[PDB]
Design an enzyme around this catalytic site. Structure first.
Site, PDB file in Angstrom:
ATOM      1  N   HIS A 139      47.094  29.699  61.817  1.00  0.00           N
ATOM      2  CA  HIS A 139      47.932  30.327  62.802  1.00  0.00           C
ATOM      3  C   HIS A 139      47.360  31.681  63.171  1.00  0.00           C
ATOM      4  O   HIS A 139      46.521  32.232  62.429  1.00  0.00           O
ATOM      5  CB  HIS A 139      49.331  30.492  62.222  1.00  0.00           C
ATOM      6  CG  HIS A 139      50.359  30.884  63.230  1.00  0.00           C
ATOM      7  ND1 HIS A 139      50.757  30.041  64.246  1.00  0.00           N
ATOM      8  CD2 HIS A 139      51.050  32.040  63.401  1.00  0.00           C
ATOM      9  CE1 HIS A 139      51.651  30.660  65.003  1.00  0.00           C
ATOM     10  NE2 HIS A 139      51.854  31.871  64.507  1.00  0.00           N
ATOM     11  N   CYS A 197      48.403  28.668  69.597  1.00  0.00           N
ATOM     12  CA  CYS A 197      48.738  29.953  68.915  1.00  0.00           C
ATOM     13  C   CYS A 197      47.719  31.028  69.242  1.00  0.00           C
ATOM     14  O   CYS A 197      48.105  32.175  69.536  1.00  0.00           O
ATOM     15  CB  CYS A 197      48.859  29.804  67.387  1.00  0.00           C
ATOM     16  SG  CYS A 197      47.511  28.882  66.541  1.00  0.00           S
ATOM     17  N   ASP A 206      54.149  37.431  66.482  1.00  0.00           N
ATOM     18  CA  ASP A 206      53.918  36.072  66.041  1.00  0.00           C
ATOM     19  C   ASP A 206      54.545  35.294  67.155  1.00  0.00           C
ATOM     20  O   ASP A 206      55.462  35.805  67.818  1.00  0.00           O
ATOM     21  CB  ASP A 206      54.680  35.774  64.739  1.00  0.00           C
ATOM     22  CG  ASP A 206      54.410  34.369  64.196  1.00  0.00           C
ATOM     23  OD1 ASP A 206      53.608  33.626  64.780  1.00  0.00           O
ATOM     24  OD2 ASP A 206      54.991  33.988  63.165  1.00  0.00           O
TER      25      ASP A 206
END
EC number: 3.4.22.-
Lengths: 227, 225
Positions: free
Chosen positions: B115, B184, B132
């Site tokens: 990620h 991501c 995030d």
């Protein structure tokens, strides 16, 4: 629910070792490892676990596995996978000197990917190799690296062919297994996945159980006793 | 509005996706090298590899040379991960020639397993922020950087005045979430694009395919749209 409870008295023991003092003080010692006050602190608050905790825990699963009803287990040290992905069979074929990796039901392979932990597991009974990430990530590569290693170890220690018939390799997706919210709990997730899996129990817990699992593991580690 | 890739541009984009010469060098800048294989990581079901993200971050760095735009320094992708695993020690030889504090903004790409998240120090707005895109928490990172600035003494023999600087893992609502994990890296790259320009994070998962096509093009031309 009905996780074993941590009595008040157990709590005193936990609080005590999270205190300050001799950071070198050997709190527990087993399997060639050594948990100190310093290692133990990595379980505090929301601190990142370190390799010593992980390896010590994985060895307790391994020691617990010595009882029946349960699947026999070998746990690889945490450095094993990374010395395998980056240097190949040769650098690690030594480590299984004196170990018949084919004589147990389950192999645990803690996988250190950067700041992150995940776990792979070779279960021979089911004839499959599975990867677990509490972050959703999937990693067929790592499962293939283990197949390769397995292949190359059969020959080497066994002078025989590794039979991949029926053998399935794969990752478990984010809905299959409880996921993390705090990045620092990744190690706790890996340890806890292996706990259920080595007892052949369903992975029952979730992220909310983590503060308690950390407290419990301090305790367990200190007594070399799993609850 | 988003800036359009014309059929002429789309045609250049179609070209780099083919079988053969995967090691062929397509673009080359900021001492980095982007090959066909690197570029494939921008295709629809693929995860951006580090070379892509480092290249894009370096493009945001060059852009930042433009007047009126805030000065920007971007750390390579292995940086934050080494500062954590190995401590300040293994990363201060990385800014030997860079004076961090002489810039408005610091970009820190955080790789976390598979990620990608992103941390920003705006020196002229006094704080670190953590984006995030998958609804995640990592509050340490945010202090490790306040820690890092303090420790980067190593550069100009002064403690760094840390008055009321704040650390927060940004909310889901507060910022566009992914739907696809594979995107991501794009999220981090594009949060980053928005920030360095000062304009707000005004896009959604819907725009990601376009953003991939566009990044292939941007990287081949070392030109941001």
């Amino acid at each position: 629910d009905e996780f074993p409870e941590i009595t008040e008295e157990m709590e005193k023991e936990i609080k005590n070792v999270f205190r300050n003092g001799n950071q070198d003080e050997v709190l527990s010692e087993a399997f060639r490892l050594t948990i100190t006050r310093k290692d133990i602190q990595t379980l505090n608050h929301l601190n990142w676990l370190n390799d010593e905790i992980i390896n010590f825990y994985m060895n307790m699963l391994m020691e617990r596995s010595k009882e029946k009803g349960l699947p026999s287990v070998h746990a690889f040290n945490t450095f094993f996978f990374t010395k395998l992905k980056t240097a190949g069979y040769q650098a690690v074929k030594r480590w299984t000197k004196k170990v018949d990796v084919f004589s147990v039901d389950i192999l645990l392979v803690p996988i250190h990917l950067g700041v992150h932990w995940c776990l792979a597991v070779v279960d021979f009974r089911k004839k499959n190799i599975t990867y677990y990430d509490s972050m959703g990530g999937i990693n067929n590569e790592a499962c293939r690296i283990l197949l390769q290693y397995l292949k190359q170890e059969s020959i080497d220690k066994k002078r025989k062919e590794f039979d991949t018939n029926g053998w399935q390799l794969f990752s478990k997706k984010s809905q299959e297994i409880p996921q993390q919210m705090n990045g620092s709990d990744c190690g706790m997730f890996a340890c806890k996945y292996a706990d259920c899996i080595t007892k052949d129990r369903p992975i029952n817990f979730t992220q909310q159980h983590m503060p308690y699992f950390r407290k419990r593991m301090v305790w367990e580690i200190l007594h070399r006793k799993l609850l």
